[PDB]
């Protein structure tokens, strides 16, 4: 299970940073939300964890 | 985090997020607990550093 | 159980000493407390203990 986690985080940080903004909004039909690019060392306000 | 008493309660809050977002991300805490029994049951005491 | 509070008790009060305030208001959103730096030796106003 820990080990989707790891792979998870690291996937969302690079979609943070090489996904443009169409592209986000173009798969979620809602308004994009940003994270600043500092932040992405930690993982603050996401958890990740299988379903 | 519980508090002790009745105005501890928002320093109880605020480390117990604190506390589990550092084994969350600055450290693997399944790897941890692995080593952690292991190294208590095999060699009958266990040692932790703390740093 | 008691090895894990052990480790908890002296971790809260590193976070008390090697953490900004800013660091914390960013890891919980919420309004940052303070404790007095000659407190720290005693518990008073915290138990810690495995969920």
Redesign the interface.
């Given at each position: 299970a820990?080990g989707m986690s790891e792979i998870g985080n690291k996937i969302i940080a690079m979609n943070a940073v090489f996904l443009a903004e169409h592209e986000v909004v173009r798969i979620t039909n809602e308004e994009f939300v940003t994270i600043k690019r500092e932040?992405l060392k930690?993982?603050?306000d996401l958890?990740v964890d299988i379903s | 985090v519980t508090p002790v008493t009745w105005e501890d309660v928002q320093g109880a809050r605020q480390n117990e997020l604190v506390l589990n977002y550092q084994f969350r991300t600055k450290l693997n805490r399944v790897s941890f607990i692995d080593n952690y029994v292991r190294s208590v049951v095999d060699d009958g005491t266990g040692i932790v550093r703390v740093g």
């Open positions: 820990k932040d930690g993982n603050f958890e | -």
